[PDB]
Paper text:
RpS0/uS2, rpS2/uS5, and rpS21/eS21 form a cluster of ribosomal proteins (S0-cluster) at the head-body junction near the central pseudoknot of eukaryotic small ribosomal subunits (SSU). Previous work in yeast indicated that S0-cluster assembly is required for the stabilisation and maturation of SSU precursors at specific post-nucleolar stages. Structures of SSU precursors isolated from yeast S0-cluster expression mutants or control strains were analysed by cryogenic electron microscopy. The data show how S0-cluster formation enables the initial recruitment of the pre-rRNA processing factor Nob1 in yeast.
Enp1-TAP associated SSU precursors from the control strain were predominantly found in a conformational state subsequently termed Enp1TAP_A for which a corresponding pseudo-atomic model was built. The global Enp1TAP_A map resolution was estimated to surpass 3 Å. Conversely, base pairing in the central pseudoknot as seen in mature SSUs could well be traced in Enp1TAP_A. In addition, all r-proteins (except rpS26/eS26 in the platform at the 18S rRNA 3’ end) binding to the SSU body, including the S0-cluster r-proteins, as well as factors previously observed in yeast early cytoplasmic SSU precursors were found at their expected positions (Rio2, Enp1, Pno1, Tsr1). Several parts of the 3’ major domain which are thought to mature at later cytoplasmic stages were still found in an ill-defined state. These included helices h31, h34, h40, and an incomplete and distorted ‘neck’ helix h28, the latter resulting in an immature head-to-body orientation. Remarkably, the observed density for the H45 loop supports its arrangement at this stage as hexaloop. During processing of the yeast Enp1-TAP particle dataset, we observed at the SSU platform between Pno1 and the S0-cluster r-proteins a previously unassigned density at the position where Nob1 is located in human SSU precursors. Yeast Nob1 main contacts with the SSU precursor were found to be established in Enp1TAP_A particles by interactions of the insertion domain with Pno1, of the zinc finger with rpS0/uS2, and of the C-terminal domain with rpS0/uS2 and rRNA helices h26, h36 and h37 in the SSU platform. The active center in the PIN-domain was observed far from its substrate, the region around the 18S pre-rRNA 3’ end. The obtained density map for the Enp1TAP_A state also allowed to trace the rRNA precursor backbone for 4 nucleotides downstream of the mature 18S rRNA 3’ end into the ITS1.
Numbering used by the authors:
A (entry chain o): 221 to 249, 261 to 419, 444 to 457
B (entry chain b): 2 to 130
C (entry chain f): 2 to 82
D (entry chain a): 1 to 86
E (entry chain R): 35 to 87, 96 to 249
F (entry chain C): 65 to 125
G (entry chain P): 2 to 207
Amino acid sequence: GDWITPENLTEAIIKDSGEDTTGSLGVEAPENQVALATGDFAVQNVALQMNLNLMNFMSGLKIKRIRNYMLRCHACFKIFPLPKDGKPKHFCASCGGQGTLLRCAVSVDSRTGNVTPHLKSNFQWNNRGNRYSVASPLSKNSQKRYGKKGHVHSKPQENVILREDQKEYEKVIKQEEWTRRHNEKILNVRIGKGRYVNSSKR
Amino acid sequence: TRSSVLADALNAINNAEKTGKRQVLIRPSSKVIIKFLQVMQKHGYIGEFEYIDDHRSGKIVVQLNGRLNKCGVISPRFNVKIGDIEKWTANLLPARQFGYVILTTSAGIMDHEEARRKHVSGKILGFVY
Amino acid sequence: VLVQDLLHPTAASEARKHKLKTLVQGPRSYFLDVKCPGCLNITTVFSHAQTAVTCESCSTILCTPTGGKAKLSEGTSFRRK
Amino acid sequence: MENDKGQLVELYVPRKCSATNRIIKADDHASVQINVAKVDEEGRAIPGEYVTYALSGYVRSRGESDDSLNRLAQNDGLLKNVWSYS
Amino acid sequence: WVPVTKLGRLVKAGKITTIEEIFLHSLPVKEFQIIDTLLPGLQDEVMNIKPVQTRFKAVVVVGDSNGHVGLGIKTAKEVAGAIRAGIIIAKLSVIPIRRGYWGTNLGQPHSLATKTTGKCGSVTVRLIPAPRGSGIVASPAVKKLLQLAGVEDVYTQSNGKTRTLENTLKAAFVAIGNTYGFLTPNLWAEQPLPVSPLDIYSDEASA
Amino acid sequence: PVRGISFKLQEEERERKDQYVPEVSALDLSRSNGVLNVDNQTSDLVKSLGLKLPLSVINVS
Amino acid sequence: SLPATFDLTPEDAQLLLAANTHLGARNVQVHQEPYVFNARPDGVHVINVGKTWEKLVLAARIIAAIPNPEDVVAISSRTFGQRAVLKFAAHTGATPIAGRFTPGSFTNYITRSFKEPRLVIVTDPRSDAQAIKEASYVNIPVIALTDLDSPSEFVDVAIPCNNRGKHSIGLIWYLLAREVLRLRGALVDRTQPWSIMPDLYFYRDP
RNA sequence: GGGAUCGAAGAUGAUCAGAUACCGUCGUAGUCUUAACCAUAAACUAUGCCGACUAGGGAUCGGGUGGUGUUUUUAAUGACCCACUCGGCACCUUACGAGAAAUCAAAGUCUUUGGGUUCUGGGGGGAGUAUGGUCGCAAGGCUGAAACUUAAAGGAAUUGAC
Ligand SMILES: [Zn+2]
């Protein structure tokens, strides 16, 4: 690995944000009247295709082409910017596919202004856990399990999350934010069933 | 250890009828099964049926039309005298005026009403209504 | 589900069933014509042979038994009969 | 259901399920009756002209309802290639 | 009255005139005044009252001796209150009964058309057709239900813990309801399916 | 705004807000260089129905 | 049968493909193995869009039979469906329910929301289960938009489509409204496209 | 015969203290093995064996078939991936059904009562006692009453005093 030290600490903290502290990371490449030095790929992405000038502040040269990562849904083939927590969202915002977003290598050119994905030509698809038995809400079995006490507010006859706009989903995303802030100042969840749903748990 | 090929066949028909299916397959066939089905067909409880040859006792596919309430076998095949037929019909059938008890007699296989016209008796096989 | 044709199953669904559970039984093995690289003499081999079949002209071996289909030797040529 | 003089003596004659021929009882509140509009040759629905089907609560509860209705509608003219016998 | 449900409006307007329409189309009934006008001859019998800890539980049977019967159970804090509310529940549950002949079809039905059974809890009740002049061969509680339905001759058999009174009445009530479920060869004929009255008079029923 | 409260100055705006429609449809192929990107199995479906469309095929593999 | 003018046109086909209605996703129920054309190597299934058209017209012919239009109820609890059903109930005479259904709306008169529908149309049979269940207590038939994972109890006419994508939900409701107005006299001819754009039905987030 | 460890019996230390209220030391038979006996257990899934039907999904163990599949290597084989199938220990979903209920792929196809066949029970005690027989070196096993006495004993599931 690499040693963290009390001198290096601030740089390491920035690296864990995902920002390029080194400069020239993945760089592949009216006169010079303005230039921008920045280490954030999200800003760089906008700058390049608007035909702005980017400055490699580690070296003093303008950048024409760069390679980085973005998300791509393999169902509908649409491309999305990588969120700043650095992992996929659960649902595709276009087609509503569940878990279909994969991180994909991408290149950008000032010259063309276009965006190009790079695909692994020998990809093997994994299909473990795509299909499984799930309860139906209107079965006679379900109506017996529901019980005689009406809606139980503790252990709330749990219903699985399967849609983006299901009201159950709205709670978990905001509650996740709340628990984050509470725990961090005091110190100062998963959806679907995963691949192995079909293997019995003792 | 199939002790009765006839008992299996009517059991398959009952289970299909209860769930609402329109067809059923039964294995194996026999002469007795064919005769029994032909009686049921005459009175309108089942549609056509078809026999498949295989050099190994064959198979039957039966069409079902939804009229059948129950069919069943009586085992053992008790001996029945002409005076006794009136008792079996009282026990087995749901009413005085529909349904049939089925007999083997040396005059053939027939329902209990035909047996009275011809004035014959023999052994009980089963019932339909 | 409630209504289906039991007498005319589709060819594709019939091909995947177990050999005893099709509408009528039948084998799925077959026979081969086989030639060794040397001789002209053809011979007939059962696809699930249990013996190590030799050529007729000489004690060269054509196949070896396994748990299932027989393994034909190298250099042999065959035609499904 | 007729007396000796030939008079009818039923209260009423029940409806029967078009899928399975079962009698629909007077309190099978899950049963339904569907009306499909007839279509004029100019392509417009004719008022008060229907093709009608009835389904028992048993069939609907068991989830067979949709498959049964495809079959019935296709042997009438209402569908083309939705249902297959095999 | 001022009917609140769609069916109530058609009844008060006089568009529907016999209860056989309601049974034929299997429509739900929510307002007791509907039965009260279509079926005026209905009369009631009170089968049991007992105190419980204080509250009163009442069991009520209603019918007319001509093919319609209903059953209802209610608990209330006053004896008169339990009976009052018990009658309302019994009227809502009214169902038809099929009756027939033990033999040759001379002169009006007098018995059941088939053997039937019903079960509730441990108790089971079985009804068997009987020849004319047998009367009702049943225990006193079950005998009263069959009279108000209008059966003349029937044999009965029973099993289980018949001393629990309300399980016995419910089981018998299920058994007579099943009489219209049994398909028989004279019902094999094919019928065109009627149009519902809620279609025909749709504008009378609205608003 | 706040829950459980309404007044004309909201109601008048909401009926305006939800009448919005873009100038060019989001489904228009003009947004997609004039073609539909589809897999091999999708183009098989089209052929089975007949029709003729400006498809473009990705292998997916 | 309906005349050849009701066949699926090439222009409508483009709309269905552009909205991704043919993407059936995963976890296929055993019923609705019909309506499936084939599977991709990655595991997504292709819905037979030709059958989607056939069933949609059949559903339209059922709605057009109702004697007076306010007796049709359209329901969507999920938010992506809410603007769609509101627009549907404006161009047709139907009655919308959007948001919380409040149990006891078809049973329990003496309720402010009490209704007596003749027909119910549901956008998602798993989320709208309360409305489907209560309809079964009172002899009401049900039409549902169904994805390949949908349960099947008490639904009488399933329309197979992608039930998750925002554009898919809006497009299907749009096409239904067009077909009922065109089986009625409200649109003069089947040959001329309707002036309302599909986008009027789409969900709008910010 | 062997005899490390642990340890019925036995010989000893303390007898104080309410969470730690039963604790510490030594140790015979035994614990292992060879040759003969004994025939009991909550020996339990508290569910007799054989056969047919009503039901679907993907995980796993053994065998087989197919694939223009990946890797080992330039083939074969091995390991892995996808589809199918026979057999097995289990799981999830489903209720035409069953049940007093808890619950049940059988505990279903039973008042609409009959596929073949073996064993056992008939309110609670007296009592697995007495007596006869039989097996065993013994401890004991198998078979097995009556006089008399009594109004309950028992199963599952609800609500909740001081
Ligand atoms: Zn997508």
